[PDB]
């Protein structure tokens, strides 16, 4: 069970994230039995999984097409501009249940949130070759202590 749960938690999160996909859109209404069905197209008739007999390369495999119906369901149903948006989420998603990379909630906090950093007037000096909202944003991305050098 702890061998095959990261495969649970990637399916509710994507399945949530459908959910909540409402709100970008009204046209964006997934239900519950949508996502059963990508998990039962995933988990059954995979041509991949056809001569795989290995429990973890089973596991993977079923992982990434999981991830690749999703997207090509939800996407196909979807505008051109949010493909990216959800290709962006999905990605986001794999990140949080991969294990041996750092959870970088940092530099997404700064991704995301990063506009809601207070510049004082004065404390953004004009730097050579950038313009005014370049060097401003320098300035906010400089705050991370991976790029205060920057």
Partial sequence: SQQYLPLSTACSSIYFTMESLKQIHFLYQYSLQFFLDIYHNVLYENPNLKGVTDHTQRLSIITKDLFQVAFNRVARGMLH??????????????????????????????????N???LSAGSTP????????????????????????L
Avoid: N, W
């Fill in 81 to 114: 501009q949010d493909h990216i948006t959800f290709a962006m989420l999905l990605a986001r998603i794999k990140l949080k249940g991969t294990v041996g990379e750092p959870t970088y909630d940092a530099e997404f906090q700064h991704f995301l949130r990063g």
């Fill in 116 to 118: 809601e950093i207070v």
């Fill in 126 to 149: 004009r730097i050579q070759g950038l313009t005014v909202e370049q060097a401003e944003a320098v300035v906010r991305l400089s705050c991370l202590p991976a790029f205060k050098d």
